[PDB]
Structures are given as structure tokens and as C-alpha cells.
Design a protein around this ligand. Sequence first.
Ligand SMILES: Nc1ccn([C@@H]2O[C@H](COP(=O)(O)CP(=O)(O)OP(=O)(O)O)[C@@H](O)[C@H]2O)c(=O)n1
Ligand SMILES: [Mg+2]
Lengths: 69, 49, 228, 231, 230, 210
Amino acid sequence: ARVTVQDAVEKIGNRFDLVLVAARRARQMQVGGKDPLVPEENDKTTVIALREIEEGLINNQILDVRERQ
Amino acid sequence: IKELLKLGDLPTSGQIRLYDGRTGEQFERPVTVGYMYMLKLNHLVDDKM
Amino acid sequence: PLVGTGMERAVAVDSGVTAVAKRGGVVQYVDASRIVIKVNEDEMYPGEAGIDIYNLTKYTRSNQNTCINQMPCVSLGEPVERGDVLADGPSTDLGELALGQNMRVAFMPWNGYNFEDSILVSERVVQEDRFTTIHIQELACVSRDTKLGPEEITADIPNVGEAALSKLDESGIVYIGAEVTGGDILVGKVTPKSDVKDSSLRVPNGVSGTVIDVQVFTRDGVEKDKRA
Amino acid sequence: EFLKPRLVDIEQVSSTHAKVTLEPLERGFGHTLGNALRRILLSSMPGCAVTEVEIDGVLHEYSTKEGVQEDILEILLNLKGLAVRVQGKDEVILTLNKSGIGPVTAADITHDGDVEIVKPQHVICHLTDENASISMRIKVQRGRGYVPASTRIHSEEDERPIGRLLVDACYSPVERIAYNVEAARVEQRTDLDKLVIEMETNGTIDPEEAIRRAATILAEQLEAFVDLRDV
Amino acid sequence: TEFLKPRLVDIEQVSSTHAKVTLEPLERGFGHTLGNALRRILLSSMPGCAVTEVEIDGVLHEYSTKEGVQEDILEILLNLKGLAVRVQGKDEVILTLNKSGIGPVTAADITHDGDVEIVKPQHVICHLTDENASISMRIKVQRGRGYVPASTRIHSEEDERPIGRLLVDACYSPVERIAYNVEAARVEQRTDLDKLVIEMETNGTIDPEEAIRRAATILAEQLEAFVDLR
Amino acid sequence: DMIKGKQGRFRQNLLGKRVDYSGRSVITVGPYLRLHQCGLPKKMALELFKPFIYGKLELRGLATTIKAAKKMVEREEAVVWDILDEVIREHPVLLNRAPTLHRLGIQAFEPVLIEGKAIQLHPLVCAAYNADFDGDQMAVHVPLTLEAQLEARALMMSTNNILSPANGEPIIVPSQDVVLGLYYMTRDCVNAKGEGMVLTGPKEAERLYR
RNA sequence: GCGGAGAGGUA
Ligand SMILES: Nc1ccn([C@@H]2O[C@H](COP(=O)(O)CP(=O)(O)OP(=O)(O)O)[C@@H](O)[C@H]2O)c(=O)n1
Ligand SMILES: [Mg+2]
């Protein structure tokens, strides 16, 4: 289990819209419109989206550019 | 109480040296052992859960 | 209690849970339901005396759903005096109050399993089966008289598998001594409409024990009720 | 370059209590072997014990017979303590039939060949009436450890007869284990130790067999250790 | 009767001397009995080779100072305790160190003998300063079981020896660190089973897996006299 | 009277509702736990996560229809426990103790399925809860929606709340056994076994002590 | 058989 989200909050310092972007990503992941960019280790889609956020691949702007594309 | 403990051939201080059942090693500083009257109260987890 | 205060006998005797001799004598018959004592000639009434009989109470339900059981203390042929303790009530032994049980404790922190006021216990305690209590739940199925027609207690119950009936008698009530589990049908009832629906009582979810007793109270005084 | 322990004199103080000695123990292995065996003995010694009982006139554990003073539940509690040795079969059916006034002890059980009643004086019940008669059929199984009724309920396997009375199974003969590592003066050596294991059991497993089986179990687990896949 | 055998030997060898070993599923309570037996045997009774005594050509007592070595004598003793050497045939052999010049006198600088191999040639021993830089010593290494502190031998030093023979604690057992955790593990229906995680650090000579191997081996030879059900 | 007053309304039914997917039980020590987890009884976990169980059962095809999923949960076969383990994996639950005095009275944990009927609470967090293992009980809620899960794991999880919101100081400080053990371990004695010997590191210190 | 009174108890 991912015991700390400290690096994800260091990516976006509000610590609140972090939850929103991670929820949007994990909702695009659960209802299978999209695919994970990280090799999953039997995590559920919430911890997958946090693991993706902490690695710098996804934020709000990447979501907006990919959605309009 | 000390007298009664002596009559039974038990340590007068009421503490005994105990061995750890997992490791087998002795505990430093002997520990108080003895019989105490305990009660099971009507608060049963299976009723609470 | 290995360490008491002496008040144990006062409390046990003065409470009504013990069976105490009224006229001292000699124990004539001992059973796990009754103690029959032949009175001594001193205390023996001249006219129309007879013997003394103490019926004991076996597992009954207390207000809190705990068990109320009396055990005999005395054996055949032992002499008893007026005011001695014949039978032990619930949580009393030989006349003394035995609220709980006395076990070997050691005061030490054992890898934080007794961290806060929590308690660590050895499997030997469960092996010797010394903290196992008997509890007793009461359940009631009531068949009233509706204006659409009286409901029935019969064992013919709509759309139930014969698995559920297997443990039911022809009258529709569980056998004494049957082991039940949550959801099993305690008694068969049909709601008049005539049937197709069941108001039959079931064991509450997640409680499982043995049916020790069943009672039937009928204002109708019907001639032919089996359980009755 | 090692030494190795050989099983030496096995003193029997009582029928249940026994002292077993192991003389040539290397320095440091006294406590190691003492504790390992203590653990194995207390946890894993296979024994036989009563699993369920059928008495005639009794529907459930809570009823009562005429002419006895114990409740049926106390009779089961007494049976749990019954120390028995089964030799060949895994499940035996013992039959107890007694009449008349007197204490029904374990000796009154119908004597079968393969079953040994270790403590015939062990009481079961007390009759109190001339015409009062108790009959029961006790089913005894072999097993290891401690298995309660409520767990076996998952595997009910047609418990349908209401006459059946389930008993908690203490499938374990060893009651107590203590060990002392003490200086073992060997005629040509300075510092060698001897392990003395004092054990109290219900008198079914013999000491030699207990120690041998415990060492066997520990050795099997060690076998599991010898190979290491790393694949 | 029929027991439950461990089905897996997961081994996570980070930093070759450091090995984590996982074992599941194990019968109730055997986690601690087996883990501890192994731990104790490894720690207290394990055949190995180590420096026992040392003779310095220059200093007579452990509190004296050698000119031009910044490290105190105690530092040199501590560095000598860490030397992990494996000798093949001989029981007790005496290695010599002779060094001059600036820099760190390391284990490689020992005279290279036939049967004796020093697993860590780069282990620092001393630091030598300028223009004098004279270090000479004779270190005696012996084979033994377990850990033997200096104090117990120096106690029994009635065989009076000439001065300069400085005793060092003998670290024979190759295991530097050993610990075991037991944790819950269930085989799909039985929950009262446990997993054994053994964290082990050895001193280079033997890798931890094989150390564990010979530990379990030793315990089995001792047990051999009783075990006969096969 | 229905509107005004404590028992009546706004307080009672409009700020004080009574949620679903919630449970209650006695709390217990569970020292082996990680700071971010909590022992949760199997049977309670199954009861709480029932609809999740049904969804996962239908996805794998183990059950044709929803009623068959209900029957399979009500028998509680091995497949059901496997599905429960799989769904519970990263799903966090909220633990609350009756007087939720400050925001640390509710915290999120990852549950670990255990036998028994008592909830196992990590010792270090007891100070935050003012929890004591003397019959204290705790309630356990399940965040359902995806947004709730992110909020529980990011904002509310136990490990994210180590400093008190009131003052900056740590909340998770060791309480009594931990501090006693550490105190015993670190205090020195004038003379003992191994007085004044020189060690190359902590590793041989443990070698010596053990 | 949703509710509400009264009594007792838990933390
Ligand atoms: N009528 C009540 C009685 C108790 N409580 C609550 O239950 C807990 C008992 O504390 P407590 O005082 O019993 C034990 P603690 O606070 O940890 O101190 P100690 O262990 O050193 O003795 C407290 O959190 C109280 O807020 C309540 O809401 N209403
Ligand atoms: Mg409390």
C-alpha cells in the first residue's frame, strides 16, 4: 500500500486539487476509457493514479491537453 | 503475606524469574506472578460487533 | 476467590440463588434436579410432618439472558443442618460467591499485546474452557386472530425447501435439542391472505445455539396441539 | 568437528511425570534444544481424545438424567479430561454402561483390546438411585493440537442425530515441560552440558516416543531449510 | 500426524552480504521456535576464523600511542576485528603486516600467503603520516566457534606472557547481524499459520543463504540421534 | 418541538445523519500493524463491502446474476474470501471514536483482514483518538465513491496526520510501553557484563547482547 | 412493528 502521498502534494502544493486531478485520472482509468502509464503491482486504480502523479507523468494540464487532443 | 509465602516455599518478595516462552531467554529483573481473581464482564465483543 | 473478604457466604446465602435447607436433617435423595431430605426427629413436626423436598432450577433465562442453574453440593447420606447450602446457584460454589475465576497472572509488558489496559491470555485458558458462559435467548411467535382469518402454526409452509422442514416436527416447531443457526426456521407460520406467504419466526441473524425448551400457551385450548 | 547428544536414562517418577536426560550437549546447544523441544512438545504432540458422546435419555447438553447429580454438561466436562491411549484405529467407539448407586468412573468402560484407559479411577458421573442406569457411547479420535466444536461445525457432515453431544477436543497429551541445562562432567572434557527435560503428561504418550517425535518434527522442518531454491 | 511443510523460499539478496529470506506457510508457533533455533546457532556457535591476539613491535599497552599514526591503538584493534579471513588447512596462522609511506594501510597490504584468503582486500587498517610512516605488526588468526571476548581470555592469562602481546576480541562466527520476524499468513482456510522473515548480514566470507544452510545442517546433525521416522 | 431542540431536527436529522456501509466493534492492540493500517474482522469486512463483492463476483463470472452473488456471499465460500481480499486490497476505511473531539478523531486506514470480532487499532494513533483498550469501541465507515477514496487516502489517512492541527507538535508520540522499553534500553549502569569493551559498530553490539 | 417515554449500562 502507498503509505504516504507527500511527494504528490509536493507536486501541487494546494494538497486539495491533488485529490481532484487524481480522482479524474482514476475515474478515466476505472471506466476503461484509458490505460495506466505505470506497470501495476496489483494495486487498485486509486493508488495507481497516485503512483502516476508522484512520478510526474500526469497533472491537470496533461489531462486538458490529452482530452482536447 | 510474607509469612504465608514462606510457608509455601515461595519467594518472600512475591516476584519470580520468568522465561520468555518464544525465545527461551530469561527476563532480567524478576516479575510479579501470582493468582488474581478475574471476571468476564457482560460486554462481549460478539454482542458489540 | 483465592483471596476473598469473607462476605462471599453472606452474599451467596442472602441472595436467593442458592438452595438452602429449611429444616435440618439427612439427605435422602440427590439428583441434578431435586434434593430430598428426611427431616431430623427434633425438628420433625408431630402431626403431619413428612419429608422436605427442594426442587432445583436448571438452565433458565435470567433477565440479562444469562443462565441460572443450580448444582447440588451435598451427596447421599450427608447430614445437613438448618441454614446450610444444599445447592449452588449461578456463580456460587459450596455457599461462597464465585463471581469469576482465579488465574495465574504476571505483571509485565509482553510485546505490546497488553499495551493499554488490554489483557493477554494463554490458549490454556480457552483449552480448559474456563471462561465460557452459557447464555439463553427467548423468542416468541404469536398467532393472533385477524379479521381475514386466524393464522396457523402448521408445518405446511409455502415455498420453503424440505431442508428447512427436516428439523421441524409435524406441528411445525423445532425439536428440543436441535442445533440451529441464524436464519433457520424456529417455528412454522402462515399468514392468511389462503397462504403463499410466511410469517414464520426464524433464528435472528448470526446467533446459533441449541433449542433447550419450547412452550405453548393457547387461549383457544385446542384439543390437538402436538408440542402441547 | 562436533559432538552430538545421545538419549540417556529416562527416569519415571510417576505414571504421568517423567524426566528425560541428554548427556553430551555442546556448549550453547543446551538451551537451543531445550527450548525447541519444549515448543514442539507443548504445541504438536499427537494424542487421542473424546470428540462426541451419545447418552440415551438426553436430547442436549443442558438436560438432566434421573438419578445422577452432575448435569450432562458437567459429564461432558469430565469426559474432556478422560486420558485414553488408542493404538491402531483413528476413531474408536467406547461404550459405558453402569447401573445402581455408585460413582461411574472410567474403569467401567467396556474393555476393548486396542484402547487403554490410563486412569481407571477417573470419575465420570455419580449415580444416586438403585434403578438409575446410565449408558453412553463415546467417540474418540486421534489428532494434534486443540480443536473446538464450533470450528468443526463447518464440517458438520450430517450431525442430524439430536442425541449427538459435541465435546471440545484437546488432542494433546503433554501438560507441562521444563528443562535445565546443567554441567555435564564428562570424564575427558572440561565444559560440556546435559539437558534434563521434566515433562508432565496425561499418561498416554510415552517419554521416549514424545522426545523422538518432537525431534523428528524439528528435523523435518530443518530438512525444509537445507534446500534453498533462490530461483 | 501429517504436518504442513513450507512451500516457498523467497530470497531478496540486496547487497550480497545482506539477505532477506521469506518462508511460508508454517504451522502455528513454529515461526519462533525455528527462527530462534537458527538465530542462536548462527550467532553463538558458528565455525569461523578470526584475529585473536596481536603483537605490535612498538607499543606495550593498549593506551600507549604510536608516533605518526593518527588512529589510536583502539582504532587499530577495531579495524583488526573486522578482518574476515578464511583459511583452508591450517588451524592457527600468523600473518605479518609491514608498511611504510603515506596513506591507508589496508588489508591488501598483508603478506600474501597460500591457503589464507582475505575476502575484503580493501578493508582499512591504519593511516600512516609522512616521512616516518613505520608500521609493523604480527596478527595471529585462529579458527573457533562463536564470539569470544577479550575479557574472558585475559582473565585466564595465568600463563604469563612477555609484554606487547595485546589481546583482541575474537569474532569467529561469520554472521554480523541476524534477526527474524514472524507474521500472520493464511492458506486460504487456515489462518493460524505464520511466515518467517530472516534478515541476515554476513561478513563477506560466506553468503547468507549458505550460512543459513550450514546452521540448519548443524542442528540436524545434533538432532539426528532421535529422528527415525523416515 | 420537532424542529427546535437537540432531539428534533437540524441537529438530529440534518447535521447528524446515520450512514450506511458502517460498523462498530471493540478496539484492540495489534502491535504488528503498520502506522497506515488497521485490523478489520473478516465477517465485518464482508458485511460492509457486500456490494463491492457482488460487483467483483459478477465481473469474474463466478455468478451469473445478482441473486446468485447474494447466495454465494451468504454461504461464504472460499471464492468469496478471495474476492474480499482482492477488493479490500487498497480500499481504505474510516475509523472513528465516539467523542470525535478534534479532526484526528476520524482517520483513514488500510484494513488487513483478521479473525475475531474486534477491530485492531495501531498503538501509536491511540493518543490522537484518546483511545484506551479497556472496552472502548470504534465505528468504521467505508468511503464509497472514487472521490471519497482519494480524500481518505490523501487528506485523512493516519500517516498524513502526525502533527496536531492545534499546535505544531507531533501527535503520534509513543505512549507508555514503547517509552518504557526505550528508556530501559538506553539507560546505562555503572557496572554490568561487557563493561568497557570496544565495539566496531551497533551490529556486534546486538551480537553481544542477544 | 417505523416511533416516543421511563430505567439501567458502556467509553
Ligand atoms: N462519562 C464519560 C466518560 C468518558 N468519556 C470518554 O471516554 C474516554 C475515557 O477516558 P478515561 O479518563 O476513562 C481514560 P484516559 O482519559 O485515557 O486517562 P488514563 O488512562 O490515564 O486514566 C475519554 O475520551 C472520555 O472523553 C466520555 O465521553 N464520557
Ligand atoms: Mg477507554
